[PDB]
Structures are given as structure tokens and as C-alpha cells.
Design an enzyme around this catalytic site. Structure first.
Site, PDB file in Angstrom:
ATOM      1  N   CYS B 152       0.866  -1.201   0.000  1.00 24.83           N
ATOM      2  CA  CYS B 152       0.000   0.000   0.000  1.00 24.83           C
ATOM      3  C   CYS B 152       0.891   1.237   0.000  1.00 24.83           C
ATOM      4  O   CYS B 152       0.694   2.116  -0.828  1.00 24.83           O
ATOM      5  CB  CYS B 152      -0.854   0.028   1.262  1.00 24.83           C
ATOM      6  N   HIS B 179       0.047   5.484   9.706  1.00 25.60           N
ATOM      7  CA  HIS B 179      -0.606   4.330   9.114  1.00 25.60           C
ATOM      8  C   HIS B 179      -1.561   3.693  10.112  1.00 25.60           C
ATOM      9  O   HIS B 179      -1.298   3.679  11.318  1.00 25.60           O
ATOM     10  CB  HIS B 179       0.448   3.314   8.660  1.00 25.60           C
TER      11      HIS B 179
HETATM   12  N1  LIG Z   1      -4.378  -5.273   5.342  1.00 22.87           N
HETATM   13  C1  LIG Z   1      -3.820  -4.284   4.651  1.00 22.87           C
HETATM   14  O1  LIG Z   1      -4.118  -2.926   4.880  1.00 22.87           O
HETATM   15  C2  LIG Z   1      -2.832  -4.631   3.585  1.00 22.87           C
HETATM   16  C3  LIG Z   1      -2.538  -3.708   2.595  1.00 22.87           C
HETATM   17  C4  LIG Z   1      -1.624  -4.041   1.608  1.00 22.87           C
HETATM   18  C5  LIG Z   1      -1.021  -5.292   1.625  1.00 22.87           C
HETATM   19  N2  LIG Z   1      -1.320  -6.185   2.610  1.00 22.87           N
HETATM   20  C6  LIG Z   1      -0.682  -7.508   2.613  1.00 22.87           C
HETATM   21  O2  LIG Z   1      -1.645  -8.538   2.565  1.00 22.87           O
HETATM   22  C7  LIG Z   1      -1.148  -9.679   3.234  1.00 22.87           C
HETATM   23  C8  LIG Z   1      -2.196 -10.081   4.254  1.00 22.87           C
HETATM   24  O3  LIG Z   1      -2.733  -8.895   4.794  1.00 22.87           O
HETATM   25  P1  LIG Z   1      -4.156  -8.914   5.537  1.00 22.87           P
HETATM   26  O4  LIG Z   1      -4.374  -7.574   6.126  1.00 22.87           O
HETATM   27  O5  LIG Z   1      -5.154  -9.512   4.622  1.00 22.87           O
HETATM   28  O6  LIG Z   1      -3.879  -9.949   6.733  1.00 22.87           O
HETATM   29  P2  LIG Z   1      -5.068 -10.909   7.230  1.00 22.87           P
HETATM   30  O7  LIG Z   1      -4.715 -11.553   8.515  1.00 22.87           O
HETATM   31  O8  LIG Z   1      -6.346 -10.168   7.323  1.00 22.87           O
HETATM   32  O9  LIG Z   1      -5.105 -11.996   6.051  1.00 22.87           O
HETATM   33  C9  LIG Z   1      -4.395 -13.212   6.069  1.00 22.87           C
HETATM   34  C10 LIG Z   1      -5.418 -14.300   5.772  1.00 22.87           C
HETATM   35  O10 LIG Z   1      -4.820 -15.431   5.184  1.00 22.87           O
HETATM   36  C11 LIG Z   1      -5.426 -16.604   5.676  1.00 22.87           C
HETATM   37  N3  LIG Z   1      -4.422 -17.676   5.660  1.00 22.87           N
HETATM   38  C12 LIG Z   1      -3.454 -17.928   6.596  1.00 22.87           C
HETATM   39  N4  LIG Z   1      -2.738 -18.999   6.185  1.00 22.87           N
HETATM   40  C13 LIG Z   1      -3.229 -19.424   5.000  1.00 22.87           C
HETATM   41  C14 LIG Z   1      -2.869 -20.465   4.155  1.00 22.87           C
HETATM   42  N5  LIG Z   1      -1.753 -21.147   4.394  1.00 22.87           N
HETATM   43  N6  LIG Z   1      -3.567 -20.667   2.982  1.00 22.87           N
HETATM   44  C15 LIG Z   1      -4.615 -19.831   2.654  1.00 22.87           C
HETATM   45  N7  LIG Z   1      -4.969 -18.804   3.505  1.00 22.87           N
HETATM   46  C16 LIG Z   1      -4.289 -18.601   4.659  1.00 22.87           C
HETATM   47  C17 LIG Z   1      -5.904 -16.264   7.077  1.00 22.87           C
HETATM   48  O11 LIG Z   1      -7.125 -16.909   7.344  1.00 22.87           O
HETATM   49  C18 LIG Z   1      -6.112 -14.764   7.045  1.00 22.87           C
HETATM   50  O12 LIG Z   1      -7.484 -14.453   6.987  1.00 22.87           O
HETATM   51  C19 LIG Z   1       0.155  -9.271   3.906  1.00 22.87           C
HETATM   52  O13 LIG Z   1       1.225  -9.733   3.120  1.00 22.87           O
HETATM   53  C20 LIG Z   1       0.108  -7.764   3.877  1.00 22.87           C
HETATM   54  O14 LIG Z   1       1.406  -7.249   3.732  1.00 22.87           O
HETATM   55  C21 LIG Z   1      -2.220  -5.876   3.586  1.00 22.87           C
END
Ligand SMILES: NC(=O)c1ccc[n+]([C@@H]2O[C@H](COP(=O)([O-])OP(=O)(O)OC[C@H]3O[C@@H](n4cnc5c(N)ncnc54)[C@H](O)[C@@H]3O)[C@@H](O)[C@H]2O)c1
Ligand SMILES: NC(=O)c1ccc[n+]([C@@H]2O[C@H](COP(=O)([O-])OP(=O)(O)OC[C@H]3O[C@@H](n4cnc5c(N)ncnc54)[C@H](O)[C@@H]3O)[C@@H](O)[C@H]2O)c1
Ligand SMILES: NC(=O)c1ccc[n+]([C@@H]2O[C@H](COP(=O)([O-])OP(=O)(O)OC[C@H]3O[C@@H](n4cnc5c(N)ncnc54)[C@H](O)[C@@H]3O)[C@@H](O)[C@H]2O)c1
Ligand SMILES: NC(=O)c1ccc[n+]([C@@H]2O[C@H](COP(=O)([O-])OP(=O)(O)OC[C@H]3O[C@@H](n4cnc5c(N)ncnc54)[C@H](O)[C@@H]3O)[C@@H](O)[C@H]2O)c1
Lengths: 334, 334, 334, 334
Positions: B152, B179
Site C-alpha cells: 500500500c 498508518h
Molecule cells: N491489510 C492491509 O491494509 C494490507 C494492505 C496491503 C497489503 N497487505 C498484505 O496482505 C497480506 C495479508 O494482509 P491482511 O491484512 O489480509 O492480513 P489478514 O490476517 O487479514 O489476512 C491473512 C489471511 O490469510 C489466511 N491464511 C493464513 N494462512 C493461510 C494459508 N496457508 N492458505 C490460505 N490462507 C491462509 C488467514 O485466514 C487470514 O485471513 C500481507 O502480506 C500484507 O502485507 C495488507
């Protein structure tokens, strides 16, 4: 010897009162707040959402005029007009202008008509001269009727600015202050003709806000007059703030060099004003921390050896009240 | 034509799903999340604390394997191993690696064993190449097995960096990002061996945190490789973030000049990726704002005409999901 | 001779550690948390978002294995399985099960294999008997291997139940607890098949949650077995909670009669467990208040003289740790 | 022909404006708020921290005096006194008293001097009669100059009271409302002689507050006059609140019987006023939900078949504005 009255029992009023009451160098004679009644003052002073319950003395006696703090009488005024405060009546020689509205020299010199000898602004002032304890406090002169203790941001930035400027030379700087919310903000989207974004619900919003401590440093450190400016973001914490200072340097310096220079000054001239930590701290770790400014070594980062971003914590409520008292005492001596 | 499966129904998983479902260019074939059951997926998708209730289609049919979104079957996997996901079975050609753990190219290429054709990281990656739509997305090549959509912060900083660099030349920059909190943080003081300050109660703390989007810009804009770095502060908002970018310039430029240049690019090449506002906005004003980055003209401030601090909002959750989809589609064409 | 080890350096672990270390009748021998390393224990214990920096002496000595609380030994274990803790091959006679997972009597008796003598659950337990200090603590018997100190909410409700039942007789009651967030909740809408609403963003939501302390009161106060039940709402405070109890009474009683009975018991037999206030308090006014329960006289309201709603504050973190230690001590006196 | 002016562009003012402007049976003629200027009204109405940016057409035309909602006239007044509003010398026939101060019938009838025909209080009133749409709205009579739409909390409780009383008979009840913060509260511990706990920092505190809607229900539903009372806890959410109602019943009823009765009435006579859900909802799931009251079946709990605790959500901001408009319309149909 050293007698204090507070005009405005705000956050800073009440906290300055805490600090004074704990000190032996000073006495607390009277207080003026039209918006709070005596009995309500007892409650407002005892119970506190940030700095905990008060764990020494206190009670209340005289109908509307005085309280007893252990065995210390304090006279109560609720007088909107700022001259009709009978200072000197209650032998209050120093006044803490903690209301936030009378912060002009012109406007602050209303307490002297009441009979007070000296007035200290708990805030910056266009006309009334400014003193950051630890930097320019000695430039005080014994004839100065009115005076200002600047702002929390100024009191955090200026000592760090001084150390860095002296050791390596500041060419240019731009400063951001990730800052907690304050009485001026609003619980829910509300009117704020003064700053349209300041009216938006403070606790569920990041709010661009306008500071000016960075130019006020020039006024308390004329060496740097016009070489700094910056901005604020109010975010949903109740207390404690932090300065992000981005500076270009005349003389090269590695990160460890500047860290160690700050450790030096934190042990030397700036013990108690400028602290120094190398720990994984956060805002709450600084609630009730009387330092003006604490360097966070792990947080900061450098780009070159002439360009660097430096992080310094400060408890906008407690540090500033501590400094206000410190300033009163330096005045009482000098 | 353009078939998508999501590995990890996180925040970004679910939101990318929202975006995909609303689009006509793309279909949503399957999803894999071992930690959520099918029926729980229906709930998690419908109700949302930030982006509101879902107001189109949806239901659920097949015991454990599929759902019906209006009349669109989606196959459900809860398979911890990342190869035993039968991609291509459910005809999912593109995969969204939204789990946050498999973000190595090495590690991300586990879905291809499952039968998938291409995998997109919803996160930065050491090895897997990086693409910020609007900047370097065209540098994509049609043989790239694995790919990353950066972060992001990167997706907010890089377009602003590009505009500023191109028009006036960036010498040095240091960037802070105020953030919102994220899934990795903790509700109460808790264990976080990875980042000791990240474990502290997220919602009542200002938390110094470590970003790296500013160096990742070099990877998506090699012109600027090594001329930027910065830091983060996590503060107690649930969503929306903002970049404070402090830069030294090669070519002089007044504040209005750079403002108008950004208005230009926001109308020209960067309509829809880089927005531009001159209004007293706040973080909530950007919840559900599909732009990668929005210049805040009233917020920023300049020191010289070579030194300036620039502020850009971005919805870390919605903007990034929008860009992820945008990237998938650019890949599908190119 | 009172030697204690803590299995699980959580919130309750760390705070129980604070309490034990500050009192002189008890000593702290060892601690076990596999997910935290020694030096990280030093940090996590020192700095605290709710209960402030620690105001005594402590640090760390040997390359792990042991810590130093002012030249005194605390042995450190990171052993995931719950036996194989050399509780006896070190010196920990009483154990605090503060992990939150081993709350079956069966599973809690794994520390005895390690060599420990008695184990106290920092939580309610299906099978293991339960004791609310101030009410039923005496029914303990000196041969009881394993035991539970109930829940924060139980320890707030039960003394009030005792006073009201004894003085006037409780016919029926339903109790609500507006409760702060806890480690089990989630910073953002997240997976929690256990309590589907518990996964929703903890800090920006009112969250219906289900307690069971009110029927569990019967289990520690058989007089009222089956005469109460209730529910919780988790709200975005860091700590401190409150019980709202709605009761029909056998014998009529005006509000001041009930106030006076509770003030009496708060001065008499239940000094230190049940407090009493007639002041305009709020949640923060009880951060670090070791009482199990504080009656809020001004807040409550009565409908008839048999139907009344009673409000009692409690610091879910501090009161409960205090009670855990208190209970250990009552046990030691065979 | 339904022409409306709003006295007080607060939260309820702005939101009522949203509601009116979106519906076609009513028009918005003028608005009065002395503390806000026209262009500031444009900003405050457009951008909103809870209910999002506005998604239709609006801006401002003449050097103050008037605004434009898509080439249509809205006259702007900033007149502190409550008469001298040319309500008739402009076109505003119905007035929304949304200031929060003029809530006496006496003082609310100042707009009639201005020329307005009928006035609706957005709040309860000592003297002015009260109407909860869906329960007693029909008892209105066509000559009633001034009137009140009660309180957000009243409009949530009263329909549930009606259903339960009618189907099974309410003997006694006590109700709690875990309620979001409002404009009257304070960002930091501040002066509020009116409610001493209300001055305490609103966003970091559970705050006991006193409602009166529960006895005020009798005033709009005389059947139960004197049969209910209760209290509030203000908690740090931006909007959305909930009622917890504890009742003894005349005729026995299992929980599902009561669920089915409420589902019935939610489908039948009380479609749109009283909703019904059996889902794992939380407060945010009701932001912008125009229903007066939503029964939460999974959250509630029963003790006997005469003693039961029932939970009902309500968006204190949106539901109430919807009801205000709805009521204006019911009035227009003489
Ligand atoms: N949340 C944000 O504002 C944001 C923004 C940009 C990028 N990201 C990136 O997105 C990624 C996750 O962020 P998020 O906020 O969604 O975290 P999150 O915890 O909400 O999402 C992770 C999800 O993946 C699932 N998961 C865990 N292990 C798994 C597996 N082995 N197979 C399939 N699914 C599995 C979990 O159930 C969980 O819901 C990170 O790499 C983060 O850097 C997040
Ligand atoms: N609060 C902070 O973190 C902080 C830090 C540094 C400086 N300051 C400065 O302190 C000043 C006030 O700040 P605050 O946070 O205490 O605001 P505040 O609202 O808490 O305090 C203002 C107080 O003054 C009282 N008051 C109003 N009019 C008065 C009058 N005419 N006579 C006497 N008393 C009157 C009010 O009752 C109120 O309690 C401002 O100038 C601010 O810049 C505040
Ligand atoms: N938090 C409260 O307000 C409070 C109040 C009353 C009761 N309780 C009870 O206390 C228990 C824990 O609560 P908490 O708030 O401390 O949660 P927590 O997560 O802060 O503490 C649990 C700790 O146990 C440690 N742990 C996990 N597995 C372990 C293992 N197998 N061996 C040794 N240590 C292990 C973890 O590192 C963690 O720090 C729960 O049962 C809860 O119901 C908590
Ligand atoms: N906020 C809620 O959840 C809600 C719900 C139900 C009822 N209410 C009631 O609505 C009323 C206001 O609530 P609110 O949240 O809108 O408060 P608010 O402060 O947001 O609105 C009051 C508005 O009236 C304006 N105003 C003040 N004096 C005026 C004057 N003399 N002439 C014209 N305008 C004036 C102010 O500018 C302010 O914007 C209160 O009586 C409250 O009890 C509010």
C-alpha cells in the site's frame, strides 16, 4: 517565597497544580476558573483519565472561596473578566495563564491590574517573549512583566534542534508531529470555523493540523530563525506525542555519532530536559514522563550523513507543566 | 476469460473479492483459506466493519466445497499446504497470494504445482519482481511466472515520487507514513518477537514501525534506486493511511507549481491512480476510495523551493485491492 | 516459604508477577513461556500500556535460563509441553496456569509431573473446583491438587451476590458486563470460528459476547445455583470492566438501605474485596485498583423496592491477579 | 407540497438533510445555523466521518444567503435568536429543532413568530408532547403547533416494549443502553457541571450516564406508565448504540416464542421500524440502518419463561433522522 495562582484550571492548569503541590520550592495560593465550581474542582483534580488518581492530601472547606490541601488553604475564583481577579489578595505573585485565550502579551497583562507581579503563558504568544527551559531560559531578564513557555512541540523540538545544530549544523529542516488529541478537538464531526479539519471527530480520524513550533524555534534559538517549519497530525491517542524531524546537515555524521552526541548532552547540560533511549518504546511508555523531549534511537533513520530523520517523544501534558514550573523557579532566582 | 482464485481470505483477500465480483472483466472461481469454514466465509464476506455490508447477490450451497454468488459457483478450499490446492481444477488461472506468509517467489510458485498459470503477491517480495500499476506496470513481461503488487505504502509513494522526480528531480527524500493498524498488530500488549513494539496494544498506542516501501520504490522506479528511505507510525485508526514525504529538489519549484503539476498528472496519465484534492479532508473521507494515492494540497508545506514536505492519502485496504485487480487485467492483456 | 512459578507470561502472567514481586510474603521462583525469550520477558514485563513502567528493580543475568529481580533467582523456561517444566527441579511449589488453554483439571495437572505441588487456574474450569476469595475461599481443602480462581467477572459479581442475597434475598437476576477488550479479540475483522463476533475489529465495535460467570456463581455459591445468568458487551477500552446486575428481591429495600448494607460490608468483612463509592467515577478511575468489585451508588437505579439494577466496577486485569495471589496465600495456610 | 427548514445544522441537522434531500415526497427549503457559514455548510454536509461522502449533487451559489442542491433553492440563515428566521418569508413550513437547547415547547414555538407552521423537536421535551413513529404516531392531531419525536433510545425501546407488552405482558423492566459518544461529551477530561462524568475523556472511558427514555415510554405508551426505568453507559464508538432490556413477564413464553413474535411484527405491522436478525452482528453492522430498532436474537438470553433479557440495536443518528422525517410526513397527512 514563590507563590503561584492559576488562571484556567484546564488540563495544563490542573497538571501544573499537581507538579507545584508536589514541589517544595513553590506554593499554590489561588486558582481562577469561572467554568468550574469549587466542589467540582476537587473532583476534577482528584480523578484523572490520563495521570491517575491523586494519592496525596486534599479536601475542601470554604463555601465558594477556598479549599484545603492537607493543611494548605487555596483561594478559589470564578471570574470571567481577567482583571477582576484579585491577585496579590490571595498572595499569588506568579500567574499561570492556562486558559488558552489570553495568550497575547497585551491580553496577558490583565492579571497585573489584579495585583500580580509576573505572568507566564502556558502557550506560544505572538508578542510575549518565549522561553524554552534548557535552551534560552537564561536569556530571561528580571524586568519582563509577561512571558511565554512556548508549546509542547516547541519544548520537544528546540532542545533536539539545539544539540543537532551545535554538533553538526542544520541547513534545512521539516518537522512532523504525530500528536495526541486535545481539548480544542471535537468528539464527533462538529463546527470548527478556525480549522475545518479540527472539527471532525477526533478519535476516529487522522487529522492534518497546523503547528508552528518549528518557526517558533527561531524565536527561542535565533541561530535557526527561518530554517525550519512543519505540520501536525492529530491521531486518536489521549496523551503523549512525538516529533519526526527531517534535517539536512552542514557537517557529515554517522547515525552512531549523532546518537552518542545526544547521549552525551542527555548526561551533560540536558540531564532532565533531554532524555535518550535505545528501547522498543511506545507512546504509553511516556505518560507521566517529566522530560521535555526523549530521543528514540531505534526509531530514527538516516539517508546520507548530511540528511537524517530523528524521532523524539514527549508527554505534551506532563512535560510541558513540569517545564512551566521549572521556568517559574528560574525566574524567581535570576 | 480471466479467472481468479484467492489464497488467503484475509482483509485483502475479501476486499479483492468484492472488487472482482463487481467487475465485468474478471470472474472469481475459487478461494482457499484453511482458517475459515465455508459458512463462516459467507458471514466474513457479507459483514464488514470498515467497508459496510455487501449490497449485491450472494448465498451458499455445497456442504463444504462451493458457494453461489447470485448464480455464480465459487469453489472452497481449506488446505494448509499450498500445492495441494487443486488450482485449474476449479479453473482458477490467476492466484492472489493474500496470506502474507508465502511472499517469496520461491514460496509463491507453489500454486503452479496446483495447476495455476500465474500468481500475484498481495505484498512486497524479496525475489519476485514488483509492479506498481501506473508507474512500472508496463515493464511486465508475458513469461513472468510470479509477480508482486508491492505494498500500500509503495503504491501510494511511487506515483507521487514519479511525478515529482520527473518534473523537478529528486535528490534525497525521507518518508514517514502515519498508518492505520493491521491484522499483524495486537489488541492488547502481547508477544511479537518479530517487532517488539508491534506487540504493544495497537489501539491505545502510537507505535514506531518499520516500513521499506521507500527503498522498494527503487525496485519499481530504478531511477530512484537508493535515494529514498523512511519509517512508519501505526496509530489507532482501523483503515486509511497517509504518506509524509520530505524531499530535496534538483530544480526549483514553488508550492503552486508542484500542486499544478500534480493536478496535471492527475488529469493526464494518472487519472484514477493519482488523485488531487484542495479540501480540508481527513482519513475517514478516504474509506472506499479506489485511488492509489491522493495529493493533499492544503496539508503540505514547503521550506525552500528545493526542499518540500508533501502529503498523500491512501486507503491501504481498498486502493491496494483495486490495484491488485488492475494489475491482473494488465497482465491478462499484455 | 511460598515459592511460585507462572506458566504463561501473558497479561495475567506479567501482572501476577508484578503483584508477587511487590509483596514480601511470597517469592517468584520461575516462569515458563515458550513464545517469549528471556530478554523479551525483560522488555514485556518492564513496559506496560495499562499499568505503567515498573517502579522497582529488575533485569536479566545469564545467557537465558535465568533472570534477576535485584540479585535474586528467577528461572526461565520456554517449554511448549506443560510437563517437563522442572518446577521441582528448580523450586516452584505453586503454579499459576495463565496460558488460557490448559483450563481442564486433567490438563492443568501436567505441572505436577514437572514436580510442582499445587496449581491455580487463572480462569474458570469445567471440572476443576472454583473459589472466589471473600465468598467461598474457606471451603478449600489442603489435599486439593488443582483448583481455579474463576473469572474476572465472577470475582466481581459473586461478592455483590453474597451481600444482596444475604441481606435481602435474591429471587432472580440477569447481569450484563460492559467489558474491555482482551487478547482473544482481533485488531481487525478476522478469523475466530470460536466466537464469530469476536473476530470483528475489537477497537471500533460494540461486540455481544457470552459469559457464564453468572450461572458459574452457583458453582461457588450454591445458595443461588440456577438463579442468575447474563451476557457481555466488549467495548473499545484497554482495561477495566463493569457489571450491571438486575435483580428481584424477596424482602423490600429502598436504595439507600442497599447502599448502607454494601458500605457496611465494604468496611466490615469485605474490606479489600468489595469497595463502595458515591462519586462520579468512570472506567479509568479504576485502572490498577486491586479490589474485586466496587459498588457505584450514584450510577445504579431502582424501580420498586424488590426490583433494582446495581452497578459494580472491576479492573479485570489487576483485581483478578491480586485475588490469584491472595488465594495462593490462603492455600499455603493449610 | 412539503417544505422543511432545519434549525441547527448539527449531526441530526445534517443527517436529516441527507434523508430529506434523498427522498422525493419532501423538499428542503432553508437552514439556520449561526455558528456555521454557507461554504462551511457545504463542507460539513459533504464530508462525514460516519455516513461517508454524500453521493448525489450539491454546492453553493450566492455570496452566502443561498445554496444549490442541483439548481434548486436552499436559503441559509445564521440568526442566533430563534425567531426572526423568515421561515415564512422564504418557504419553510415544517421546522426541525435540531439545536438541542430549545427543547421546551415554550421556546420551540419561537419559529412560529418567524412564520413557520409546525415544529418538530429532535429530542424529548418536558412539556411538548412526544411521538414514537410505529407505536403512538396516530394520536397526533392536526392543530398541534409544537411536538417532539422523543429520543434515539426511546425510539429503539418503545416498539420492543409494544410487541412484548402486547404479546405477553410486561410486569416490570429495567433497561441499559450501551451508547456511543455524542457532541455533548468531551475529547479530554473537561468541564461539564451538567453531568460530571460526561466531561471525562469520552473516547477512553466507560461512562455511566442517565437516560430517562424508559419512564418516558409511559409518556408515549401509557399502558406501561411507571413500569420501566434504566440507565446508559457511553462507550468509545462513533455511532450505533444498543438497548439491553430486562423484563418479568405476565404470561410464560419460551425464547423462540418471543423471537417468532418479534419476527412476525418485524414482517407485519412493524416492517421498517422493528427489524429482526439471527446473525453474529456488531455495532458497525448497523451504521446507516434507518430502522428504529433491530432485535438481536442470538445475543439475548432468558432465565425463566417470565424473566428475560432482550437486546436491540439502533443507529442513534440515522434511525432517528429517518423517524423525524417520517413523522413530518405523517403530520402532513392532516
Ligand atoms: N491489510 C492491509 O491494509 C494490507 C494492505 C496491503 C497489503 N497487505 C498484505 O496482505 C497480506 C495479508 O494482509 P491482511 O491484512 O489480509 O492480513 P489478514 O490476517 O487479514 O489476512 C491473512 C489471511 O490469510 C489466511 N491464511 C493464513 N494462512 C493461510 C494459508 N496457508 N492458505 C490460505 N490462507 C491462509 C488467514 O485466514 C487470514 O485471513 C500481507 O502480506 C500484507 O502485507 C495488507
Ligand atoms: N493540553 C495540552 O496537551 C497542552 C500542552 C501544551 C500547551 N497547552 C496550552 O494550554 C492552553 C490550554 O490548554 P488545555 O489543554 O488546558 O485546554 P483546556 O480546555 O483543558 O483548558 C482551558 C481551561 O481554561 C478554563 N477557562 C476558560 N476561560 C477562562 C477564563 N476566562 N478564566 C479562567 N479560566 C478559564 C476552562 O475552564 C478550561 O478548563 C492552550 O493555550 C494550549 O495551547 C496545552
Ligand atoms: N485478560 C483478562 O482481563 C483476564 C481476566 C481474568 C481471567 N483471564 C484469563 O487468563 C487467561 C489468559 O489471559 P491473558 O489476558 O493473560 O491472555 P494472554 O494471551 O495475554 O496470556 C497467555 C500467555 O500464555 C502464554 N502461553 C501460550 N501457550 C503456552 C504454553 N503452552 N506454555 C506456557 N505459556 C504459554 C502466551 O505466550 C501468552 O503470553 C485466560 O484463560 C483468561 O480467560 C484473563
Ligand atoms: N446525536 C445523536 O445520536 C442524537 C440522537 C437523538 C437525538 N439527538 C438530539 O439532537 C439534538 C442535537 O444533537 P446533535 O448530535 O445534532 O448535536 P450537534 O451539536 O451536532 O447539533 C447542534 C447544532 O445546532 C446548532 N445550533 C446551536 N445553537 C443554535 C441556534 N441558536 N440556532 C440555530 N442553530 C444552532 C449548532 O451549530 C450545532 O451544529 C440534541 O437535543 C440531542 O439530544 C441526537
Amino acid at each position: 517565597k514563590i507563590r503561584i495562582g492559576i488562571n484556567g484550571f484546564g488540563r495544563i492548569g490542573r497538571l501544573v497544580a499537581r507538579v507545584v503541590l508536589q514541589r517544595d520550592d513553590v506554593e499554590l495560593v489561588a486558582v481562577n476558573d469561572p467554568f468550574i465550581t469549587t466542589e467540582y474542582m476537587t473532583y476534577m483534580f482528584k480523578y484523572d483519565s490520563v495521570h491517575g488518581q491523586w494519592k496525596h492530601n486534599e479536601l475542601k472547606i470554604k463555601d465558594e472561596k477556598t479549599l484545603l490541601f492537607g493543611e494548605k488553604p487555596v483561594t478559589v475564583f470564578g471570574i470571567r473578566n481577567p482583571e477582576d481577579i484579585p491577585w496579590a489578595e490571595a498572595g499569588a505573585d506568579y500567574v499561570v495563564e492556562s486558559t488558552g485565550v489570553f495568550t497575547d502579551k497585551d491580553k496577558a497583562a490583565a492579571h497585573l491590574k489584579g495585583g500580580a507581579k509576573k505572568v507566564v503563558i502556558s502557550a506560544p504568544s505572538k508578542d510575549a517573549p518565549m522561553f524554552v527551559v534548557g535552551v534560552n531560559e537564561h536569556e530571561y531578564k528580571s524586568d519582563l512583566d509577561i512571558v511565554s513557555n512556548a508549546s509542547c512541540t516547541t519544548n520537544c523540538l528546540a532542545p533536539l534542534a539545539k544539540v543537532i545544530n551545535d554538533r553538526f549544523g542544520i541547513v534545512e529542516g521539516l518537522m512532523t508531529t504525530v500528536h495526541s488529541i486535545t481539548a480544542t478537538q471535537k468528539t464527533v464531526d462538529g463546527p470548527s470555523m478556525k480549522d475545518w479539519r479540527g472539527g471532525r471527530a477526533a478519535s476516529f480520524n487522522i487529522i492534518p493540523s497546523s503547528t508552528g513550533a518549528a518557526k517558533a524555534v527561531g524565536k527561542v534559538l535565533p541561530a535557526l530563525n527561518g530554517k525550519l517549519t512543519g505540520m501536525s497530525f492529530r491521531v486518536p491517542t489521549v496523551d503523549v506525542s512525538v516529533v519526526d524531524l527531517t534535517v539536512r546537515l552542514e557537517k557529515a555524521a554517522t547515525y552512531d555519532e549523532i546518537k552518542k552526541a545526544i547521549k552525551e548532552e542527555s548526561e551533560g547540560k540536558l540531564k532532565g530536559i533531554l532524555g535518550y533511549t535505545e528501547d522498543d518504546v511506545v507512546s504509553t511508555d511516556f505518560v507521566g514522563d517529566n522530560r521535555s523531549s526523549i530521543f528514540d534511537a531505534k526509531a530514527g533513520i538516516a539517508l546520507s550523513d548530511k540528511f537524517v530523520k530523528l524521532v523524539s517523544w514527549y508527554d505534551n501534558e506532563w512535560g510541558y507543566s513540569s517545564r512551566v514550573v521549572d521556568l517559574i523557579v528560574h525566574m524567581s532566582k535570576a
